[PDB]
Symmetry: C4
Subunit: 236 residues, 4 copies
Amino acid sequence: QRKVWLLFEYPESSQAARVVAIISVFVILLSIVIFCLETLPEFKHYPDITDPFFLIETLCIIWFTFELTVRFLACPNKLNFCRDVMNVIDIIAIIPYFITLATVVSLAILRVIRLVRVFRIFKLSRHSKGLQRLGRTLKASMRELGLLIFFLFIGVVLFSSAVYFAEAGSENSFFKSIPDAFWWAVVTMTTVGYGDMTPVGVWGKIVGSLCAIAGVLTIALPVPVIVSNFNYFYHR
Amino acid sequence: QRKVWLLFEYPESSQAARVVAIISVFVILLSIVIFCLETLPEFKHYPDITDPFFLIETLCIIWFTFELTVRFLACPNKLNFCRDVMNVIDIIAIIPYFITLATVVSLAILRVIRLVRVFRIFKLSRHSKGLQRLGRTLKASMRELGLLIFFLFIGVVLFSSAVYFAEAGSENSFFKSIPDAFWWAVVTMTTVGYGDMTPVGVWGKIVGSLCAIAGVLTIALPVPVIVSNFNYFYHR
Amino acid sequence: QRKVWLLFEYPESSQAARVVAIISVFVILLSIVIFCLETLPEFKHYPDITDPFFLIETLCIIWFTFELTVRFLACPNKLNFCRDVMNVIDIIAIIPYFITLATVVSLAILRVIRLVRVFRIFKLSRHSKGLQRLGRTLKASMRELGLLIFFLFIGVVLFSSAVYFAEAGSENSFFKSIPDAFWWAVVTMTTVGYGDMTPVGVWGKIVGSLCAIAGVLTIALPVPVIVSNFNYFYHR
Amino acid sequence: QRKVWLLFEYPESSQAARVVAIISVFVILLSIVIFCLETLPEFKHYPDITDPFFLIETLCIIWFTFELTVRFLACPNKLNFCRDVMNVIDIIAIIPYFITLATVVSLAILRVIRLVRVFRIFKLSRHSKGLQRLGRTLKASMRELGLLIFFLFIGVVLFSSAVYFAEAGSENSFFKSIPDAFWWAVVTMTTVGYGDMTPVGVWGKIVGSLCAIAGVLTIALPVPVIVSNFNYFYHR
Ligand SMILES: [K+]
Ligand SMILES: [K+]
């Protein structure tokens, strides 16, 4: 039990453990590539047993379930294994296949279950030493970042309402309502700035200028929040 | 008096005070949602007693006025109650309902008062300690932010003048005048960058490149201003 | 001499000096507003004595020349009066009127001399206490800003070359040559991001992705340069 | 040998050394300008001996090869000469001419070798005192910048998948597949924001809003990484 546990959990234990970690990384990358390529227009049909993409998916899922079963059996205690995030992300990454397999042997639910496979990238943090530190740094500042998001929501509602009320007098305005102007306000406060929605009126232009100024303010506001978490997790 | 105080003002004093604060936050959120929703194209008519949006608005306004009256009567000092901003934001948020009610029982004046109701968001700062801290941090750096805004205005005027004078030789130019170029210059100095207004001439392109460089400078500039206020209120 | 000095130069000396400084600020603002408003299509025709804009310009120029002559006569040293930038910005701002007046009593030369009036904003630095400090902060980091501009130029040339050579295989590409791609590359490295020029090819999209990443790098790069100048002039 | 080595690679050795460095900078700039101007439509043909754009190239390449040969012959040892980056970049800068010359005396391969001439800019680092410091600062932070790029890739894959799956129900959507959405997700996470690809659905707009928020996060992320490298290489 301990031997296989250190073989599958500690890649630095031996060369075989490093090989296992490398093959796990390769399988994760292959599954991600297959998931991305499956949606290409020239590959989709208008699934089945003979589909090569299906075969690669079965191989990846078989490896994932074998690794998960081995780790669960070799875990020192079941509660810790079931409570660890790096294992819950793995158990979420396998269920969408099994739901699909049951139908082989309503479209609204099909929209989300096929989506959940994107989380396959998340066990890369296990094998990436730097990514664990980055995740810890992000988590340590999650409260202040949430507060910043709340402030951004306040500003986005303010500017959306202002621009809609200043643009109500234009017959060709894109802003039909504040819920419609939310997209523009959040794409302005965060400095992306698509050309698909811009004010045309003078008052709308003034409100947009104020929103752009607030966006300049808010693109630099979380910088001190990132500091004192970064430069802090690297020296101690 | 003192019984209903520390209860309508201090949620942490008792469970009843926490319940009152929670219901106040819920009413604020409901009023904000109703304000944003009522202008949707499928909801607006082309007000009245039977309108459900009107009923929810009356409920929210009744709760707001009851809370404001209770707080005013229970305050230990009438002088500072009016001077406090957290109460002026409350008293502004109730006026537009009463103006609307009088007409039920110049159109430009009607649009601004309707916009005034959007200040309902600001009472959320009372129940959010983090928002109070963020507001204090922003207020502590108001003067330097104003200086930065003045510098941005100087740059925006300079670049609008430059781009208009460089673009005067093009018959298809969007920049008809310096006020027209103001929108583009403030959209460039801020890194939003809409595609609705771009120079087409070579000299216009050079001026736009210089404006973009100055925009990188002007949004990388207020970072140290936010610092020494953040990381300062959280450490002292 | 010394009586009108410390009065035309030091507003804080007496109430009369403060009044003179206030009237100078008002004249500068009026001249700037008139300059911006003169180019509006409604006011422009398709100059003369009876033009109200011309009258306001003559009043502003008369005040400027009177103030400059008084300051020059009252200065204790003629050598440094010309060398000081706050006086050279004044002396450029008066020239365009005199050139225009001579014609009333090659068109490319006419557009630049009209343009150079934009520098009327810069005398506001004399009467703004914080603008001088901000200018000193910017000047103290001029060399590193120039280094950053040189790096940005290197990156812009590299990415323009890459995108043009990866996009020449498309008949509908906007990039006709490296100078054409310069505009897109400097619009991408700076995070303005206009939609007027975007790659359409796959290789063009990859090069654009790399340019956008380098743009994030180059917009986050000058922040430490602004620091150690800001927070340095405010503490020492 | 040592005398000419000091004359060539040490611009501070004498006035002649400074002259040699200046002429090398001038030749590099001339080659860059010629390379950029060669692709202009007014100059391209639809090469030969009489082409002036070929003669300037021959002169630049002759100077480059003379300098390279002199430096190689005057070097103290061959290993460091062939291992130093500022010399290997010179090696890459001369080969493309010789390949072109052979043909005068598979088309895609002929195009990439033309592209690789862009590296002519990189010899400017030798003669720029501050560019070496900037390169050292960038190199010292390359390990963490790679991790940041990896995080950006994870986020870009996640958001591309989310936006494609949310936008699958729209017949007019621009997102045909996850690789198509990769361009938009990069353009969003980096705060550039072209208007060529935007979601139109409500769920697509929500996913785009989340991607923009994460883009603000990822543009604020690398600032602390640049610090502790800057302000560190310039003080010790
Ligand atoms: K931006
Ligand atoms: K943009």
